[PDB]
């Protein structure tokens, strides 16, 4: 079209909510069409595009460590002076560490143990990664993401490592454990749409999966339950690539996503929180906050995930720990 902004998107149910609450209304108001590009891991792609010469995307979501790794080479400064008055109210009620020169955290994500509660009712329900590995006591098909993050920590915890002693990750130990469960894993997933589909279709009986989709399905009456016990909570930082084709439109969309009332609408339609208190304050039914990954009850049960570890230089030296872990995992899957 004549006026666009190119926005990374997770797809699935959350993508649908984003389109309905955020992106279509944005186009109606501003005239700027939001072109969504489905991608679950943009960091390596932003880096490759920057090396090739020209960014293809305007607004992306990346991990904490990626705002640092990609900052100098590949990410533009966010011009906070261009954000709306409403957006500044949201920013004012956000933690310091979530507002960076190169990225702003707009989403808090939970990842945890999810299971079919028809097949595992009462106290036959798995509660730990050890239970997840215990195919005898809890029979069924497992599914896990095809990444070292989360899966390695879960493996270590199934092997008896306590939540506060995971880092730095013993990768050889984790991989050995993953091989043990591998025969029972029906799918090593990569996209947000997959786990809900796998569990609803009965293709999998329990997952390490995003909690937002599963909380929503449980509220819909699906035979799904989950726990944040030994789970993971992290922030998606929204960043604009250096040389973005539509930089100014990207700031407008960032401003739109930071509106307290619109964010409250989004986060009440699909339970992924924006980490600012005023978004909670603007929500008409605040009970839905119990599903949010930044709810203190959920945070308490989860581990303290370490983006810092995953972005650190690996023993190999020329890769990050995450890249090193992915190489090892690639060779297993």
Domains in the chain: how many in total? Answer: 2
Residues 6+ apart with CB under 8 A from 142: 132, 181, 184, 185, 186, 204, 205, 206, 207
Residues 4 and 99 in one domain: yes
Coil, strand or helix: which one is 140? coil
Coil, strand or helix: which one is 54? coil
Give the β-pairing of 60-62 and 224-239.
antiparallel
- Print the domain residue range for 154: 111-233+306-333
* CATH number of the domain within which 99 lies: 3.40.190.10
DSSP state of 259: -
- End-to-end CA gap in the chain: 41
Residues 293 and 283 in one domain: yes
CA 36 vs CA 5, 33, 42, 193: distances in Å: 8, 9, 13, 15
Coil, strand or helix: which one is 206? strand
Contact 286, 280 (CB under 8 A): yes
**Long-range contacts, stretch 276-280, CB < 8 angstroms, 24+ apart:** 276/90, 276/91, 276/93, 276/94, 277/93, 277/94, 278/89, 278/90, 278/92, 278/93, 279/90
Give the β-pairing of 104-116 and 33-38.
unpaired
Class of residue 56 by CB neighbours under 10 A (exposed 0-12, middle 13-18, buried 19+): middle
Position of tokens 């809900």? 196
* Bond from prior residue into 168 cis (ω within 30 degrees of 0): yes
Residues 149 and 199 in one domain: yes
Approach to solving = X-ray
Residues 99 and 248 in one domain: yes
């Amino acid at each position: 079209q004549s006026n666009v902004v190119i926005m990374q998107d997770p797809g699935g149910g959350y993508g649908d909510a984003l389109r309905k609450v955020m992106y279509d209304p944005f186009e109606k108001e501003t005239g700027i069409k939001v072109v969504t590009v489905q991608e679950a891991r943009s960091g390596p792609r932003i880096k490759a595009q920057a090396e090739a010469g020209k960014a293809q995307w305007d607004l992306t979501f990346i991990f904490d460590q990626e705002t640092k790794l990609l900052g100098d080479c590949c990410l533009a400064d966010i011009d906070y002076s261009k954000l709306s008055e409403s957006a500044h109210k949201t920013l004012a009620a956000m933690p310091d560490n979530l507002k960076r020169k190169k990225g702003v955290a707009l989403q808090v994500i939970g990842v945890g143990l999810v299971y079919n509660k028809d097949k595992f009712k009462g106290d036959k329900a798995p509660q730990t990664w050890a239970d997840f590995w215990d195919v005898k006591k809890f029979p069924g098909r497992r599914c896990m993401p095809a990444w070292p993050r989360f899966t390695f920590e879960a493996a270590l915890m199934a092997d008896g490592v306590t939540k506060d002693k995971l880092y730095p990750i013993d990768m050889d130990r984790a991989l050995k454990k993953l091989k043990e469960i591998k025969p029972h894993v029906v799918k090593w997933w990569t996209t947000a749409a997959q786990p809900p589909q796998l569990i609803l279709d009965g293709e999998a009986d329990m997952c390490l999966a995003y909690t937002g989709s599963m909380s929503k399905l449980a509220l819909e009456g699906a035979p799904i339950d989950l726990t944040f016990n030994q789970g993971f909570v992290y922030y998606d930082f929204f960043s604009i690539p250096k040389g973005a084709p539509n930089y100014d439109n990207a700031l407008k969309l960032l401003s739109w996503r930071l509106d307290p009332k619109r964010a409250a609408q989004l986060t009440s339609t699909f339970p992924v929180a924006l980490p600012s208190k005023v978004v909670f304050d603007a929500a008409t039914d605040k009970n839905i906050a119990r599903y949010w990954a930044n709810n203190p009850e959920n945070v308490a049960k989860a581990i303290e995930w370490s983006p810092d570890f995953w972005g650190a230089p690996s023993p190999a030296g020329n890769s990050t720990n995450e890249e090193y872990g992915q190489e090892k995992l690639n060779a297993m899957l």
